[PDB]
Design a protein around this ligand. Structure first.
Ligand SMILES: O=C(O)CCC(=O)C(=O)O
Ligand SMILES: O=C(O)CCC(=O)C(=O)O
Ligand SMILES: [Fe+3]
Ligand SMILES: [Fe+3]
Lengths: 251, 261
């Protein structure tokens, strides 16, 4: 049995990633694959206990699933993901954080403008922004279902309801200089984005869900300092073993 | 402490490797690194017992017995390129050091490594490569590895079968005939890539190659690491060699990180 040989990004892709701070690959996973993930996500929302996050009673978010779900443990080692994380971080990699964020049809909240790295640096002791997130589209992402929205190029000046958010004025400057972009794509796409890229999102006014599986890969050299770490393991990993790719076996 | 971020080949370098079947990177390792490797090689020649072939001709399997060599094969100078060219996680199928000393050395008849690994070890496909670290400058005169460029583009070429293969004999179990070769050479030519001490020569599992005697006052030490795709792991059921010739532990390799020791 055979996995397709590892595909990596082209130089133009890598360049576009580094310059914009994000990149969309369309149609990485097929419908049946996405449906397996959606089904597993539903189980995790149902069984995740303290790892779940609610609509302030509908389970809207879950953390750490790759530690508790075999499906999600294998997803993070997928040959569609791991080789690109290695390529873009230029190292062996591990999962710093895993979360699933669902914005249900006609539901959802404003996520204020923030940089993930600010949080990881201060709360988890991540020493440099040598990390990224892969957002898997469980549903088509459109103008109207609360897409992640970024400042392109905004990762490039380093680190500027949520504990750390970016004020009116610091954001105005960024946006005046760089603009705002909400990347779109079909179900099964992957959105790669820099640990330090500012982003925000709005409620979903569409009649369709917007589920995202968000895998944060970190460089092994860039491992967090667990002595300055606050959070439990399902928020901020502590096992820095380099991930290996899944191979095609008989089961 | 910091390892330089992993360097991979440019797309022009990859294209040249896939077209020619080989590629040289100059000056990968510095002098001091090379000297560490040279001293460990001398330790392996002295202590390798049955793993040495005989001047001492070469030693096999050293990454399983030497910590220095076990680290080398995980080097961030090597591993990320092996993964990139094989499009997979990788492991070491075989590790050898071929001495070839000054004014000495022996003819290495024409062969394709994959012919051996396929028949002797049960390698299923040629999704493997070798990285040859130059312990000494490689010149026209010290018996360089020589290739038919593009000669890997037709798979194994039929070979008369001694009866454990060992690439470290003058007389090889699977050589290519003066007539099979004449045609190949006529058609594609011959190239003996050169380079400074510390360079790495990458070459395809299926590229035909050979070398001649060293006629120089200069040794031509090579550390040859054969990386195989994890998916392409050998069938240990049809394997005929000990582990120090053909690996059986297919664990994916991870890159060395910079530690305080
Ligand atoms: O799902 C969203 O729209 C925002 C999520 C986000 O940026 C985060 O979890 O850091
Ligand atoms: O060291 C040499 O000259 C050639 C070695 C070789 O091709 C092999 O060992 O398969
Ligand atoms: Fe975020
Ligand atoms: Fe050979």
């Amino acid at each position: 049995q055979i996995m397709e040989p590892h595909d990596t990004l082209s130089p133009a892709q890598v360049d576009e990633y580094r310059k914009n701070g994000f990149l969309v690959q369309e149609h990485v996973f097929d419908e049946e694959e996405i449906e397996l993930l959606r089904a597993e996500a539903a189980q995790e929302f149902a069984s995740g206990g303290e790892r779940v996050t609610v609509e302030q009673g509908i389970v809207r978010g879950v953390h750490g699933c790759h530690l508790y779900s075999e499906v999600f443990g294998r997803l993070v080692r997928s040959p569609r993901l791991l080789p690109i994380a290695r390529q873009l971080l230029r190292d062996d990699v591990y999962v710093h954080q895993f979360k699933i964020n669902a914005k249900r049809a006609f539901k959802g909240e404003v996520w204020e403008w923030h940089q993930d790295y600010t949080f990881w640096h201060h709360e988890d002791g991540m020493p440099a922004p040598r990390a990224l997130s892969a957002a898997i589209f469980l549903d088509e992402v459109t103008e109207f279902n609360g897409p992640l929205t970024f400042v392109p190029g905004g990762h490039g000046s380093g680190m500027i309801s949520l504990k750390y958010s970016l004020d009116v004025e610091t954001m105005r400057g960024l946006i005046e200089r760089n603009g705002m972009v909400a990347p779109k794509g079909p179900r099964g796409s992957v959105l790669w984005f820099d640990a330090n890229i500012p982003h925000s999102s709005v409620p979903n006014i569409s009649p369709f869900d917007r589920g995202l599986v968000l895998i944060t890969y970190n460089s092994v050299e860039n491992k967090t300092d667990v002595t300055r770490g606050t959070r439990p393991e399902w928020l901020a990993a502590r096992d820095f073993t380099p991930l290996t790719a899944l191979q095609a076996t008989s089961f």
